[PDB]
Design a protein around this nucleic acid. Structure first.
Lengths: 51, 192, 217, 136, 54
RNA sequence: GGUGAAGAGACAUGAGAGGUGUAGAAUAAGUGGGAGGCCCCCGGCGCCCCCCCGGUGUCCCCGCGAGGGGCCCGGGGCGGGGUCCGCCGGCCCUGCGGGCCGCCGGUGAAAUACCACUACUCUGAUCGUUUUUUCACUGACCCGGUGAGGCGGGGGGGCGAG
RNA sequence: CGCGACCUCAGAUCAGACGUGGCGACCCGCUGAAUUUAAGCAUAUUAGUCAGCGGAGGAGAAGAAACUAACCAGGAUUCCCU
């Protein structure tokens, strides 16, 4: 479920990535706080690949 | 197919290299039973002679338990780590090679937990580690250290990328070999 | 040189954007300018600019201001040393019924005042007008006590349907302390008005001229 | 601390060791008993965390339980009474499957007293618990 | 669909050496692409070749 | 609850580029403007690669010479090639010591004798991820039979056959 | 092949220990209906109750807060008044 959301953030439709995380984990608090951790890791991936 | 962190557990050492490792260790094994007691009793008697007690220097020795080994690895006080490859729950030391990669601590995967057990009075020991050794043996250590780290640390990339198993049984190997032989043999069947 | 490629991404730091633009050879003057993409940037329809900025130095392009009048700017013209004229004939800086022949824009900035708001092409005339940009409305200046404002070329951001404007962030010879303030005082409003949906995956590009305009995060 | 690493590992999932070593129990509970002694707590993390010490006198019995609802046992499934007390499909038992397992192992082995239990696998129609037991 | 006569090619024909014509003629068939490799369905075919042309 | 192989699909990455019209002489270069960019051939300086030896202070030879000397410092000079990155000078910042209708004169696309911010995707399509189409794979699952008795490869191999 | 470890896994009239079974007044965990009441009747009520099962003790379960609160704040469990 993390990898799927990471791919959906790769295509960058955050309003669907959030819905995916919510419908699986449950609480909008947790989905909001978890999309941040999925980003800032995808960001690290791209940043260290272009490096 | 075993995962990468499990398939790392199958490129164990070369036998003769392990033999140098063990012959090194057997001058370093800790104190076993009926030795402990005699040394301690003699030390109690040296107390009245002011030349030895329980608190006095012990030359460098082994560090066996997983908790102790991981503690001193994450404090970077380890110069060599050995790992028994066949451990009952693999999750005990699945992480360990990654830790050694993180902190540059040389580490090797030996066959058998029984040998590490024989390295003490106990029956088995998941890992052992040299922190420091007698200087006269430091070079002999360092040569084996280089031989180990050449193969287990610098290629952590391919190790973690590795996959395993997936090897199809000989029955099906022959069964597919029939049709591969047939197609290779009669290829170019049409005038094409 | 026939190079347009900025293959960089390019991340170094948020405020260290002053240490990577300095690719200097041009013994002429290098218009080290600034621009940004068009994807999800509607050239005219639903998205456009109004933001303000102030540079320090006039680059190679002529960044000077003059008449109109539209009072207090008659006095500004007579003080900033340009002949001033109200309506007599639209022959100051036009492109068709002109007086002199310099660069088609003849300058890179002309502000407004508050008698009417479409009188710029009627007083000094076209230029940016002929190029399809409008220097007559939304100038955000009146400058009755500021001439150093125009000789440091107080300027703006403004839409265009071709691609966009392109506004300079300094030169290489002048320090990078200039460029850092200029970028971080110009594109803060650009980040505000273009980072609402477009999340800035690619970068804001610097027209760092002489054959290598690039970008920096 | 090694047990910190082990803890974090068990907390995470999506590694196949569960699939590998769950069959190692599904086969053997059908070769040998569905209730049998293990010689070592497979999760020395969780056993110790619940309270365990490998001092002599401590046992663990790993035991299988069959999962599902609980169909109400009556002949031909039509229960006499007012029609809110019908219903035999969707009924749900009132104790944790972990608790059912614990009591099964306890009642099987007298002279051994329970201390706690924990989860080791869950196939499709089962649950693979294990119980820590003291020899009092 | 795709023109069915696409990948059928004229496999050659031959007689016994005891006759007087060895290159009798030709016959079309498709090659190995699916599960119907050509020679498999090619063996068992039989022609009608007469003395009055051979 | 898994595997492979092929066909239909989306896309993120990804090395390589952009000519021709409706006002004029080129393409008046997705666009920005430079009436002058030098792609700086360039004195050569900022200065890299030999010699020259102040600290003949370093010393492989070494163990004792005797020097080829390898070396590290630091040095009053391009011995010689120079856009090997890049600041002054001189010139048509070299259309004529390459090079490019004049942008501004075509009321235009933002005009392009020039710096050139962008990318229209088609550039090898690697290379990943994913939706589907079928074909097959067996290791969970199930099915039988037996006192779990010659299973799959091979070979000697003997029989004869051609 | 042979030897030797560890691991798994076995039998034993092996050495020493231990459990079942009863009582059930009170306690604990499950299961748990219908008469009856609504003037009829099914939701409800009777009731998480009688019947059923398992398990103990001198008492058992509880118990030191993932608590109450909203105040100028209290502060494990149980029992009585309220």
């Amino acid at each position: 479920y993390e990898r799927r959301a990471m791919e959906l953030l790769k295509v960058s439709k955050d309003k669907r990535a959030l819905k995916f995380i919510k419908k699986r984990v449950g609480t909008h608090i947790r989905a909001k706080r978890k999309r941040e951790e999925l980003s800032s890791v995808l960001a690290a991936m791209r940043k260290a690949a272009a490096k | 197919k075993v995962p990468p962190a499990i398939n790392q557990f199958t490129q164990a050492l070369d036998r003769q290299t392990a033999t140098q490792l063990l012959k090194l260790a057997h001058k370093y094994r800790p104190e076993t039973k009926q030795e402990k007691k005699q040394r301690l009793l003699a030390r109690a008697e040296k107390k009245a002679a002011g030349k030895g007690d329980v608190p006095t220097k012990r030359p460098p020795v082994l560090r066996a338990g997983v908790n102790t080994v991981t503690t001193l690895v994450e404090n970077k006080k380890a110069q060599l780590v050995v790992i028994a490859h066949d451990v009952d729950p693999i999750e005990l030391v699945v992480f360990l090679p990654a830790l050694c990669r993180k902190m540059g601590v040389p580490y090797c995967i030996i066959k058998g937990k029984a040998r590490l057990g024989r390295l003490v009075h106990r029956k088995t020991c998941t890992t052992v580690a040299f922190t420091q050794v007698n200087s006269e043996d430091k070079g002999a250590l360092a040569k084996l250290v280089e031989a180990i780290r050449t193969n287990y640390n610098d290629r952590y990339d391919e190790i973690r990328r590795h996959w395993g198993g997936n090897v199809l049984g000989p029955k099906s190997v022959a069964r597919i070999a029939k049709l591969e032989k047939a197609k290779a043999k009669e290829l170019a069947t049409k005038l094409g | 040189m026939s190079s347009k490629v900025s293959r960089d991404t390019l991340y170094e730091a948020v405020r260290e954007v002053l240490h990577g633009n300095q690719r200097k050879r041009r013994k002429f003057l290098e218009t080290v300018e600034l621009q940004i993409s068009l994807k999800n940037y509607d050239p005219q329809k639903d998205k456009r600019f109004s933001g303000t900025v102030r540079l320090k130095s006039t680059p190679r392009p002529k960044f000077s201001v003059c008449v109109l009048g539209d009072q207090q700017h008659c006095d500004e013209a007579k003080a900033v040393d340009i002949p001033h004229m109200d309506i007599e004939a639209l022959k100051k800086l036009n492109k068709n019924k002109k007086l002199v022949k310099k660069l088609a824009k003849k300058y890179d900035a002309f502000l407004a005042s508050e008698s009417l708001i479409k009188q710029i092409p009627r007083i000094l005339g076209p230029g940016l007008n002929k190029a399809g940009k409008f220097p007559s409305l939304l100038t955000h200046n009146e400058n009755m006590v500021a001439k150093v404002d125009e000789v440091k070329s107080t300027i703006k951001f403004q839409m265009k349907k071709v691609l966009c404007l392109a506004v300079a962030v300094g030169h290489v010879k002048m320090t990078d302390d200039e460029l850092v303030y200029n970028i971080h005082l110009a594109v803060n409003f650009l980040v505000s008005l273009l980072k609402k949906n477009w999340q800035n995956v690619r970068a804001l590009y610097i027209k760092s001229t002489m054959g290598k305009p690039q970008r920096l995060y | 601390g090694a047990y910190k690493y082990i803890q974090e590992l068990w907390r995470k999932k999506q590694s196949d060791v569960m699939r590998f070593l769950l069959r190692v129990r599904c086969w053997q509970y059908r070769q040998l008993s569905a209730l049998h002694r293990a010689p070592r707590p497979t999760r020395p993390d969780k056993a110790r965390r619940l309270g365990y010490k490998a001092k002599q006198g401590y046992v663990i019995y790993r035991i299988r339980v069959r999962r599902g609802g609980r169909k109400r046992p009556v002949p031909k499934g039509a229960t006499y009474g007012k029609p809110v007390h019908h219903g035999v499909n969707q009924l749900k038992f009132a104790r944790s499957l972990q608790s059912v397992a614990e009591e099964r192992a306890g009642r099987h082995c007298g002279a051994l007293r329970v201390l706690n239990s924990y989860w080791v696998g869950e196939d499709s129609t089962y649950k693979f618990f294990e119980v820590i037991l003291i020899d009092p | 669909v795709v023109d069915p006569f696409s990948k059928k090619d004229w496999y050659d024909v031959k007689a016994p050496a005891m006759f007087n014509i060895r290159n009798i003629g030709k016959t079309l068939v498709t090659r190995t692409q699916g599960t119907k490799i050509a020679s498999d369905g090619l063996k068992g075919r039989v022609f009608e070749v007469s003395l009055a042309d051979l």
